[PDB]
Design a protein around this ligand. Structure first.
Ligand SMILES: N#Cc1ccc(Cn2cncc2CN2CCN(c3cccc(Cl)c3)C(=O)C2)cc1
Ligand SMILES: [Zn+2]
Lengths: 346, 314
């Protein structure tokens, strides 16, 4: 029907407030929920309804800073929350040593991302420590893990690594040649990109691969024109009305961004059917509580609310800022990031 | 031991065996963001979990505490890591842990942490004997579970268990020829065993796919496989294919077939074929058929492809 803008603003506001225990599984990734909410409000031009200062302090309390003896550099970055019980410290004093305290790549990414959205200048971010932490996460095959203690490794984290290097405007955080190699090896026989070599190509991993290359400014250099044409074909074939993540799977609102953003980066989103996509996204809108679900008449969540809005943004919805398809923040935010980078180079 | 919903469950703060430990609370500071409220029981388990973690206590009681922490929140990766540290320190029976994780995964098949945990265990035991059957069970409740297929490919590759996968793939394609995950598996098996350079294999596969396409002509997965195993060899290098497809157009038509033809014609133009201007027109005619009536949702795309062909071959 129509875009329930006000309701979504309230939805995101509630996400930043207090949640029922039924959401406990989000504990270690509260920072990404904050990101969906803040970046979502930013996208709707309503960051004024939140106290940017309080939130900035909270985010900084999540940074894993190097200890006095700097013997934990390989573990720096940001935590998803304070579940470890480390005493509140908004990146003021040094780092309180702890056997199992370290950053999580997706949190370092959404964390830095949130700081920029809120207006902070990243002066309290130990840039070198984060980059050291990032380097430690990369594997021999070029992909990344999420934490130094070990985890699964795939395209999702390659994207996080790329975003971090881009935001800190320093690529010493990764061995770019090896990352590119990983991205190439993930291309499937059907031409989409998978999470890793041999796996089923997917809309999410294709976005991560393509966006990473664009952030590195090496899209053209890595894939030939023929290859890019094949990838474009695979991506545009994902539209049914809304978009699905892989052949023969039902559509899900978030793919309007995962795939749509990829198509935008490949410069052919303009050739997709806007109306059917918009109609589908809006049909997953929760008219009562706000936010978007993956399917109509389904429960909404922060992730699908944010990506649904970004999907709408791709077609320039009346009332929604333009989204930077590769960085996943508002263009307004990417512009502010540009200034920040300029100001540092002095 | 003592279940979280047992009538006789006792908070850790009331257990004698935990008297010496001072619980460590979580503090989100002055103004918390995205704060989750916890029940007494929940906060109690984690207040002691933090205590044990902070002191890196490699004890048996800590090991049992992780079982409760996991029941409360299986997505906490730190808990799983610590449990692995304890499994080693206490030299626990890993065969028993396999039973544990096997049950956990069945209840939460989409959780990244539980699949990672199982993979570490299998690496430790160097025993993949249970894997293929376990995965087949999970795939039985969700034949497209990305985590299951990923784990299956890892096991097969790591312990070279290729012997029966192609047969497993054939079985699943009969159950649902539209499962894109299975078609991917098929290419995974073949390209990692015989490869496709063996003309006898390529022929067997192309023939197999055409048979599947005839059964269900509107199936992107089957068409993607067919084009996938031939595109790098050169679609135009297979004259009988072009005609066999043109013979399907009458009845077994679909946008996938039309698209395939356009791609064949494009390969021809790319290799300075005979009747360049005639071929180009055959392609353009199809692009417009796709845009105007066969794949209308991609109307603007196909027309864009058309314009691309003209400006490149004229
Ligand atoms: N990529 C991808 C992907 C994987 C699975 C899905 C399936 N899916 C559909 N609706 C929700 C989901 C689950 N996703 C959200 C994206 N994501 C992610 C993406 C990028 C970075 C990071 Cl840290 C995390 C995940 O780990 C899990 C969708 C997209
Ligand atoms: Zn989704």
């Amino acid at each position: 029907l129509d875009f329930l803008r006000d309701r979504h603003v309230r939805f995101f506001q509630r996400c930043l407030q207090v949640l029922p225990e039924r959401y406990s599984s989000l504990e270690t990734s509260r920072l990404t929920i904050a990101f969906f909410a803040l970046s979502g409000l930013d996208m709707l031009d309503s960051l004024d309804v939140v106290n940017k200062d309080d939130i900035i302090e909270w985010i900084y309390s999540l940074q894993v800073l190097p200890t006095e003896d700097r013997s934990n550099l390989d573990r720096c970055g940001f935590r998803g929350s304070s579940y470890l019980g480390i005493p509140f410290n908004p990146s003021k004093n040094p780092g309180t040593a702890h056997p199992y305290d370290s950053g999580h790549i997706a949190m370092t990414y959404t964390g830095l991302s949130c700081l920029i959205i809120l207006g902070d200048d990243l002066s309290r971010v130990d840039k070198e420590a984060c980059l050291a932490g990032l380097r430690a996460l990369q594997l021999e095959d070029g992909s990344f893990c999420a934490v130094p203690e070990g985890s699964e490794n795939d395209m999702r984290f390659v994207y996080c690594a790329s975003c971090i290097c881009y935001m800190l405007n320093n690529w010493s955080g990764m061995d770019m040649k090896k990352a590119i190699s990983y991205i190439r090896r993930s291309m499937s026989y059907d031409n989409g990109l998978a999470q890793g070599a041999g796996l089923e190509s997917h809309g999410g991993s294709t976005f991560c691969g393509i966006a990473s290359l664009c952030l590195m400014g090496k899209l053209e250099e890595v894939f030939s024109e023929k290859e890019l044409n094949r990838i474009k074909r695979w991506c545009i074939m994902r539209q049914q009305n809304g978009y699905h993540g892989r052949p023969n799977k039902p559509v899900d609102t978030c793919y309007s961004f995962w795939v749509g953003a990829t198509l935008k980066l490949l410069k052919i989103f303009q050739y997709t059917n806007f109306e059917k996509n918009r109609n589908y996204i809006l049909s997953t809108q929760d008219r009562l509580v706000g936010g978007f679900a993956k399917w109509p008449d389904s429960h909404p969540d922060a992730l699908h609310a944010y990506f649904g809005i970004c999907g709408l943004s791709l077609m320039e919805e009346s009332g929604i800022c333009k989204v930077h398809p590769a960085l996943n923040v508002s263009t307004r935010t990417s512009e502010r990031l540009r200034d920040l980078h300029q100001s540092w180079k002095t | 031991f003592l279940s979280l919903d047992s009538p006789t469950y006792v908070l850790y703060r009331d257990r004698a065996e935990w008297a010496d430990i001072d619980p460590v609370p979580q503090n989100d500071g002055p103004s918390p963001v995205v704060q989750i409220i916890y029940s007494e029981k929940f906060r109690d388990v984690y207040d002691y979990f933090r205590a044990v973690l902070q002191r890196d206590e490699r004890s048996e009681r800590a090991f049992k505490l992780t079982r409760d922490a996991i029941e409360l929140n299986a997505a906490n990766y730190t808990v799983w890591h610590f449990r692995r540290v304890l499994l080693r320190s206490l030299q626990k029976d890993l065969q028993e842990e396999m039973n544990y994780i096997i049950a956990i995964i069945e209840e939460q098949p989409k959780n990244y942490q539980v699949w990672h945990h199982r993979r570490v265990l299998v690496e430790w035991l160097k025993d993949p004997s249970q894997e293929l059957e376990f995965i087949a069970d999970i795939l039985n409740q969700d034949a497209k579970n990305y985590h299951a297929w990923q784990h299956r490919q890892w096991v097969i590759q790591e312990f070279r268990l290729w012997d029966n996968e192609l047969q497993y793939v054939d079985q699943l394609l009969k159950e649902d020829v539209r499962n894109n995950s299975v078609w991917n598996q098929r290419h995974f098996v073949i390209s990692n065993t015989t490869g496709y350079s063996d003309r006898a294999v390529l022929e067997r596969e192309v023939q197999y796919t055409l048979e599947m396409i005839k059964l269900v002509p509107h199936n992107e997965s089957a068409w993607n496989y067919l084009k996938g195993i031939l595109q790098d060899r050169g679609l135009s290098r297979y004259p009988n294919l072009l005609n066999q497809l043109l013979d399907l157009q009458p009845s077994h038509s679909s946008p996938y077939l039309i698209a395939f033809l356009v791609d064949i014609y494009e390969d021809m133009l790319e290799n300075q074929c005979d009747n360049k201007e005639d071929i180009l027109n055959k392609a353009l005619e199809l692009c417009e058929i796709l845009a105007k009536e066969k794949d209308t949702i991609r109307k603007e795309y196909w027309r864009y492809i058309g314009r691309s062909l003209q400006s490149k071959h004229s």
